[PDB]
């Protein structure tokens with residue numbers, strides 16, 4: 001009694017994604033995730049001036065280019081042997097932090113929300129699934145359904161301007177956005193002035209107000225209508241985080257700390273234990289067993305028998321692990337926003353102080369949205385602090401020279417999850433460059449041992465009571481905020 | 490009255506051209522979508538998915554045959570029979586599945602369009618995906634049209650990403666022309682098919698640092714005063730109106746902040762590299 005559903009393109013994610021599921025007895029029983037577009041940045045980068053990489057890698061993705069730029073300039077800092085100044089570190093955090101806000105807002109509203117909110121009857125809001133299980137369908141009190149839908153739709157529309165203001169904030173010290181100019185090996189290219197710090201701050205306060213007063217309340221309200229969506233889209237429940245937004249000059253402390261949570265147990269993150277498999281990916285490896293990124297290889301092969309994706313399959317200690325706000329928030333376990341503490345009590349009867357107090361509810365479709373909203377608030381609190389710490393006039397740039405032979409690795413968290421860039425230099429040129437990105441950890445295919453990637457695994461058990469309107473499949477996938485440009489590069 | 494119908498397709502892109510469009514002001518994106526264009530298909534933001542999304546795209550391309558703009562973001566990879574970019578799957582009338590390559594999609598839609606607009610340096614000129622080291626046979630729209638012997642009005646709006654003003658301005662000018670061709674002639678294009686309205690000015694000739702350049706006052710590092718030439722600035726070889734328009738609603742621009750990397754030019758990136766070595 002199995003039925004196959006194939007969705008290509010899976011829209012309202014970044015990039016080219018195909019999802020295939022098998023449904024039996026009203027639930028997903030198997031799944032395949034496929035990235036269908038390849039560019040090969042790791043090949044393109046070879047032989048270049050290593051400093052060019054922080055411009056080239058941003059073109060992996062126009063949604064998260066600051067994450068790639070950050071990872072790249074940190075890899076370069078490491079390889080070149082240069083230490084960034086206090087003000088350089090803070091300025092880089094302000095550039096990147098502004099895009100964390102932009103990316104999460106863009107995601108929830110402009111990618112995710114049309115699975116819940118009924119837009120106006122003009123393209124691109126229509127056509128849509130006939131039985132889309134929207135707010136206007138779920139809420140049986142018609143006036144309340146209309147009011148809640150209008151509330152959500154007005155936020156979607158207002159968020160168009162809020163995300164644009166976030167890019168004004170990125171451009172303040174970043175030069176422009178998408179694709180900043182302001183981060184380089186050795187720090188940042190423009191020293192913040194008192195006037196420009198104030199101009200960033202004024203815009204930031206508008207974004208922060210939207211986050212606290214509109215976004216957080218909408219998310220908790222949405223979850224209170226879709227309580228069933230805290231009970232599915234579960235997956236492996238393994239998460240990893242690398243650390244993001246260093247809070248001191250020796251990169252020992254972060255806003256969100258590194259760590260791993262596997263099979264119910266916390267452990268430290270050890271980069272030696274990351275490897276990539278390609279058994280079901282369109283790539284050739286020179287040796288079996290999966291490869292650590294420091295010896296990674298990018299030899300595309302769309303004819304490889306048994307392969308189905310251009311995404312490689314990263315594993316940590318041979319375990320699939322997911323990444324993103326859920327991962328970071330689970331690992332750090334920060335205190336919840338005052339809004340979240342209040343609305344969890346008022347709308348759900350849940351007493352919760354810290355993220356982990358959500359328990360099982362964290363590992364679900366709605367849990368991923370909640371994690372992302374909470375992290376938006378948490379990042380705003382941090383940006384508010386950094387705006388007080390930044391020192392007008394203080395040097396942000398330190399000179400360096402391209403080394404003959406070196407290696408460096410930049411570790412960070414992109415808005416979608418753990419990110420590293422590995423850089424090897426020989427004869428002052430890029431010898432190897434290997435990118436292990438966020439969505440790479442989420443939207444990967446099966447490894448050589450048949451273990452499904454996190455999105456594939458989280459699809460198992462998702463309800464599909466209506467095969468012609470399989471809305472929960474896209475809801476699960478979009479809860480991960482996938483970026484297939486990043487996943488494949 | 491009537492909005493410009495748009496089918497927006499992505500090949501080997503990064504979505505940055507789309508994101509830059511979302512940053513538009515005067516008009517802003519809400520007004521663009523509700524009042525200026527009918528964005529019929531766009532993979533990043535549209536409500537429908539899979540079969541429904543593709544069926545809608547093809548329905549619009551038929552209904553509005555010769556009367557929609559085909560917007561292309563990203564390059565077209567031709568190696569391995571186009572299999573480096575699969576844009577969707579079509580479910581025939583018997584249940585069998587068929588993948589659609591970017592090559593197949595553009596070959597199909599371009600002849601149906603009123604005009605094709607290649608937004609971004611990737612689609613216009615090949616850009617980063619077509620740069621040295623790539624193995625995907627990555628190609629620009631103009632080169633793919635030439636190879637395919639497709640004669641369709643083509644306008645290039647380059648930049649990595651293009652400024653939203655360039656994309657909106659070009660599309661509005663094209664639509665105005667279609668509605669009244671003698672009152673609104675098509676914008677004059679340069680030899681690389683991009684509008685002189687936005688790409689006629691040389692950055693360096695219009696740069697506020699030109700007085701410093703003339704006096705040999707060069708910034709020793711990014712955070713020192715002076716012209717940016719010694720830091721790698723490609724303004725001298727780059728044609729765009731960034732010096733006047735600036736970026737992100739006039740907040741900053743590449744040259745004030747750092748250096749121009751020549752992102753609008755047909756030889757970007759290879760002819761503009763290394764980025765931090767002077768021209």
Ligand code: SF4
Nearest residue numbers: 503505609610611649
């Ligand atoms: S032109 Fe640049 S910003 Fe646009 S799709 Fe290509 S890489 Fe991305």
Ligand code: SF4
Nearest residue numbers: 693696716717722724
């Ligand atoms: S900063 Fe660049 S564009 Fe401006 S005068 Fe100097 S070299 Fe020319």
Ligand code: SF4
Nearest residue numbers: 731743749750751752
């Ligand atoms: S200043 Fe140069 S690099 Fe910046 S947007 Fe204009 S052309 Fe592109």
Ligand code: FCO
Nearest residue numbers: 064414415416439486
């Ligand atoms: N966020 C983001 Fe992009 C992804 N996945 C990166 O890195």
Ligand SMILES: [Ca+2]
Nearest residue numbers: 302303572588
């Ligand atoms: Ca194939």
Ligand SMILES: [Ca+2]
Nearest residue numbers: 042434435436
């Ligand atoms: Ca990689």
Ligand SMILES: [Ca+2]
Nearest residue numbers: 636637638639
């Ligand atoms: Ca032909």
Ligand code: NI
Nearest residue numbers: 061064483486
């Ligand atoms: Ni991305």
Ligand SMILES: [S]
Nearest residue numbers: 064066067099
């Ligand atoms: S980012």
